[PDB]
Design a protein around this ligand. Structure first.
Ligand code: ZZ7
Ligand code: ZZ7
Ligand code: ZN
Ligand code: ZN
Ligand code: ZN
Lengths: 244, 244
């Protein structure tokens, strides 16, 4: 492949990843893949956003869309061509473009979409389309089971306000993988990204709440970095400690 | 007859009020009273915090506690001596001291307490006792009625992040009264108060959502001001418009 996608922020390509259209796919587990799409900024470079694809028996579950509807449609085509299994549902982590930019692609494909109820409420103001179903959460952050039917190994957890007020996280039961979304940055991150809609008071405790909810997860997946160790949880929690 | 209680910030005592210990109670409707507690800090002065007391049939419903357990305990003494009806439940509008400082007094009295699930999640890190039950809200902002058992005329609505990420509002059916809490300031206020836990981006949209959820409320009740007209909603929303 003469000429590969090398973004300015986000992980770089390496053999073991599979370039598919404008996107990059990396297998993290026998049944878990990471999908990476790129937002080409006008004179700034590609901005990578990561999600996850999970095979649960005869169906496939998706975590987070791509930046655009087109890149999200390419994800579904990669699923049909490489896994050849229907997508049962998708769950998006919060109401920003890198997570809900491709809702129209999922809804055109007939896939049931789930999000935090606050995400569906904030999606109008963020220029996003809400998900079809709303997730609600208990007082300790765990999702109400009645609102997440047939989620399989997807264990959804709301850690509290951090990167946004509505950011949620997803642990993959039966694996050692947990997804932190835009709430967690890698262990060598220089900052905590876009603090525009961030909760600077509760960010630190929300990072640890995510780590305490999945204490056995050794691989942590985030939006704009290669999968890291639990030191990613630690680094951003102490980075957010400086926001006092 | 000289000498009353004089808050440093908050409404004065007007004719038609009634002092009862450290509090003052003002009747707003045949079955709706407003309670006001005072937090005095050595060297700064007293700050007033307003809540609501609703008589619905043969029971009393309380909205928000006082600053302290002791002040809250005097609220139920006022209910026992001025109404003498059982206090069915209590709903608190967000996890801050002026609205949740007296949770232990209600729990010791055998009163069922209700709060936004986010308020209960944030309660330990804000120094508050979490409520006994959690309220969840749909994407449109209205409370899921399965978690608000027998609230009577109380119409709970979550307008979105504003003063805090968890502030909720309450309307009283059969009256012209809706409670904005700390989200809405009076029509001649010069600031939005404490913005440390505030969502500067969605404050304006959350204030307007509160006004649209209770379009018949001609009398708006807030935390640190005498009740005002709907002009308080517009003045709060336009003040928050400059925050973006
Ligand atoms: C990639 C970033 C460094 S900025 C970015 C992201 N931004 C977007 O997806 C779009 N800029 C956007 C445009 C309009 C509305 C919402 C998002 C977000 O705020 O999560 N997240 C950052 C992050 O995840 O830390
Ligand atoms: C009048 C207040 C500055 S205090 C009140 C309340 N905030 C508090 O009680 C503070 N969290 C607080 C201040 C000093 C000491 C302890 C707590 C709220 O969030 O509605 N509303 C604020 C406001 O409307 O800006
Ligand atoms: Zn974001
Ligand atoms: Zn992001
Ligand atoms: Zn207040």
């Amino acid at each position: 492949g003469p000429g590969e996608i090398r973004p300015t922020i986000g992980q770089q390509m390496e053999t073991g990843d599979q370039r598919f259209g404008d996107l990059v796919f990396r297998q993290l587990a026998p049944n878990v893949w990471q999908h990476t799409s790129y937002l080409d900024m006008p004179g700034f470079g590609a901005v990578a956003s990561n999600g996850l694809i999970v095979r649960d028996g005869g169906r496939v579950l998706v975590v987070d869309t791509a930046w655009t509807d087109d890149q999200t449609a390419q994800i579904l085509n990669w699923i049909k061509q490489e896994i050849n299994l229907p997508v049962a549902l998708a769950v998006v982590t919060h109401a920003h473009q890198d997570k809900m930019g491709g809702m129209d692609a999922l809804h055109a494909a007939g896939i049931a979409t789930y999000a935090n109820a606050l995400s569906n409420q904030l999606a109008p103001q963020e220029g996003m389309v809400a998900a079809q179903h709303s997730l609600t959460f208990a007082a300790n952050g765990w999702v109400e089971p009645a609102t997440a039917p047939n989620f399989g190994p997807l264990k959804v957890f709301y850690p509290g306000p951090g990167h946004t007020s509505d950011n949620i996280t997803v642990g993959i039961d039966g694996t050692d993988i947990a997804f932190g979304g835009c709430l967690i940055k890698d262990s060598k991150a220089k900052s905590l990204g876009n603090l525009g809609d961030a909760d600077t008071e509760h960010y630190a405790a929300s990072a640890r709440a995510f780590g305490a909810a999945f204490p056995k997860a050794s691989m942590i997946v985030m939006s704009h970095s290669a999968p890291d160790s639990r030191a990613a949880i630690t680094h951003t929690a102490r980075m957010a400690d400086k926001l006092r």
